Amino acid sequence: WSWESYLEEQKAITAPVSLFQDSQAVTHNKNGFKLGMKLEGIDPQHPSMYFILTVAEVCGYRLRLHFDGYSECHDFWVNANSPDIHPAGWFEKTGHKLQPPKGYKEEEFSWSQYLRSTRAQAAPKHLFVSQSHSPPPLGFQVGMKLEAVDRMNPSLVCVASVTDVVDSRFLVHFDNWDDTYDYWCDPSSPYIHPVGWCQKQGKPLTPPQDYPDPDNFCWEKYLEETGASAVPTWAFKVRPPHSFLVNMKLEAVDRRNPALIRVASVEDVEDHRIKIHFDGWSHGYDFWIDADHPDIHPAGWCSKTGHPLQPPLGP
Amino acid sequence: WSWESYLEEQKAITAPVSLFQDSQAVTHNKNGFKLGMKLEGIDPQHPSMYFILTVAEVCGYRLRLHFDGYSECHDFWVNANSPDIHPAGWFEKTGHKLQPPKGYKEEEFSWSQYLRSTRAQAAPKHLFVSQSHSPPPLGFQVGMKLEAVDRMNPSLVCVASVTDVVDSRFLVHFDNWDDTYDYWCDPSSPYIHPVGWCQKQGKPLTPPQDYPDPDNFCWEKYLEETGASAVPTWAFKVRPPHSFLVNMKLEAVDRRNPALIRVASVEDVEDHRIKIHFDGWSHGYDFWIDADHPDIHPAGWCSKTGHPLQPPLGP
Numbered sequence: 001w002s003w004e005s006y007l008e009e010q011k012a013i014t015a016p017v018s019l020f021q022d023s024q025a026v027t028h029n030k031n032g033f034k035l036g037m038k039l040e041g042i043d044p045q046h047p048s049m050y051f052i053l054t055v056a057e058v059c060g061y062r063l064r065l066h067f068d069g070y071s072e073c074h075d076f077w078v079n080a081n082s083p084d085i086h087p088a089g090w091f092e093k094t095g096h097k098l099q100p101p102k103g104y105k106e107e108e109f110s111w112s113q114y115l116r117s118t119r120a121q122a123a124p125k126h127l128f129v130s131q132s133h134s135p136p137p138l139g140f141q142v143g144m145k146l147e148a149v150d151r152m153n154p155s156l157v158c159v160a161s162v163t164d165v166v167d168s169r170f171l172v173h174f175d176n177w178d179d180t181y182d183y184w185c186d187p188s189s190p191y192i193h194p195v196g197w198c199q200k201q202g203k204p205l206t207p208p209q210d211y212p213d214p215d216n217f218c219w220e221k222y223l224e225e226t227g228a229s230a231v232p233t234w235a236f237k238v239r240p241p242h243s244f245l246v247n248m249k250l251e252a253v254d255r256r257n258p259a260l261i262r263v264a265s266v267e268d269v270e271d272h273r274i275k276i277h278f279d280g281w282s283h284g285y286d287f288w289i290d291a292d293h294p295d296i297h298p299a300g301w302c303s304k305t306g307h308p309l310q311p312p313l314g315p
Numbered sequence: 316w317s318w319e320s321y322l323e324e325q326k327a328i329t330a331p332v333s334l335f336q337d338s339q340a341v342t343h344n345k346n347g348f349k350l351g352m353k354l355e356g357i358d359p360q361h362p363s364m365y366f367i368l369t370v371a372e373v374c375g376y377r378l379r380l381h382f383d384g385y386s387e388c389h390d391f392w393v394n395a396n397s398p399d400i401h402p403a404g405w406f407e408k409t410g411h412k413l414q415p416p417k418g419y420k421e422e423e424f425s426w427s428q429y430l431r432s433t434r435a436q437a438a439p440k441h442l443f444v445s446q447s448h449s450p451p452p453l454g455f456q457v458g459m460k461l462e463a464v465d466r467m468n469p470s471l472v473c474v475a476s477v478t479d480v481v482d483s484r485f486l487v488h489f490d491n492w493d494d495t496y497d498y499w500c501d502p503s504s505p506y507i508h509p510v511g512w513c514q515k516q517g518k519p520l521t522p523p524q525d526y527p528d529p530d531n532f533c534w535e536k537y538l539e540e541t542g543a544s545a546v547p548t549w550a551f552k553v554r555p556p557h558s559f560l561v562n563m564k565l566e567a568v569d570r571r572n573p574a575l576i577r578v579a580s581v582e583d584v585e586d587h588r589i590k591i592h593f594d595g596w597s598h599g600y601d602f603w604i605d606a607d608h609p610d611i612h613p614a615g616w617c618s619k620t621g622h623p624l625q626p627p628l629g630p
Contacts, residue, residue: 155530202517204519215469215470
């Protein structure tokens, strides 16, 4: 199977490499992660929370991570240039809480004693693109307030806080709601707005969960009572629309089976999202995804990185 | 104590009779209701439901009603010209459900057997202003849909239905919410609007409780699925604002002890409501009330109807 003959046969084109972020397109970096290496990382189910993880599997420029002490059914895949993993020791140098292995209490864990018990190696620091050493997202400080879209209830723009800052990204948290609504963001995110944006648009602002008298909700009073500042208006950057067009082909991680990467086409587009179709599969498997998601890639990505590519499903 | 004497010490004025509805002002009708007379009436705490009620007390042009079979702690006062009471036998001739006395099954209650058991008399029909013999509210039929303010959550305007029609009034019900939010209305009510009013106002509409995918609520889809039509826009009338002014004196039922009527003053106003202050009492007892409410009356009303009036609280 080749992309060249496939595109010739389909009279189609791939999405040019120039439409991707460098982190999505880069194939010339070696994967330095090795089986058994230990590290810290974000739980994709609880994006505010950090766990001790072990490398369970490597495939191309991707790794499968295991939560030490828990079931292997929680394992998940990342790219080796993921900014959501960090070297052993990072949590204590940068102000982050680390969930210990199942069994430990969080004043009974140290890395030096845990590496001694397990005889394991921490992944070396030079492997990690994000160690809190890069310039921060200008203007967004921990504790500052903004208006954010709830991506699980996307018709709602809500009162939200910056609760974590790591390199050029920050965590959006919805005041008084479960942390499982949190998501990582940057200054150009189309989902975040300055305090006062809703009122300027004649849009309903959703106040914190069970705010007393939500009808009389007023930002100025809320900021005063919480000892908080608004993220300043100048910090918010216009992200321009992506340039993907319908029928352009690419490679995408299968969401039902994330060990696998399949030949995919752009089925539909919005300003900041694309709809993925897996060639040869039912359209029931189509899904919408952010154009900057780390799990879509230009054609050739699996081949240059050493990951198997699934061809179109054919007879 | 007299009004003439009091008005002179306060250098004050009474709200003129022409500011009130005729039904709030009328003093020359006699109270024909008698202790122990039985009738049917709306439960004020469940405005959609009808119960068997007994006259427990009469004071001037007011009567206290007791729910047969239930605790006296639920007793309530109405005026003798109330539209919310009907003669025995009305429910069956008009398509309404009667809740029987506590402990009876509905089906095993009949008025004639119940009058025989209690040896009581039904209040005669000529006492009742509302027997369902008058023209209906034009344009409002059972089953028609409209938008209504939820008076318990007054920032919300919601999908609502006409569920009952009695003489000149109709009952507004909030689709898929419980019946305790229902309220009685006429065509001039400030709280109701035609289908599509929110949209034209750039105001959000609250769809029925747990409507599947509530952001796409489409009135015309909803009207079709429910086999329903909109109340026509022509049927909604403008109510002009009241002309009560701050400082006018009047008489009002005490909401904490509703057997009592006190000298009151208008503390504040809106287009359709006044704020009542009880002379000589703490302002912590001030309350808002709709200006057409049956429990406010002009100065002189207690005197002319034979009801005791409480003078201002003094040292």
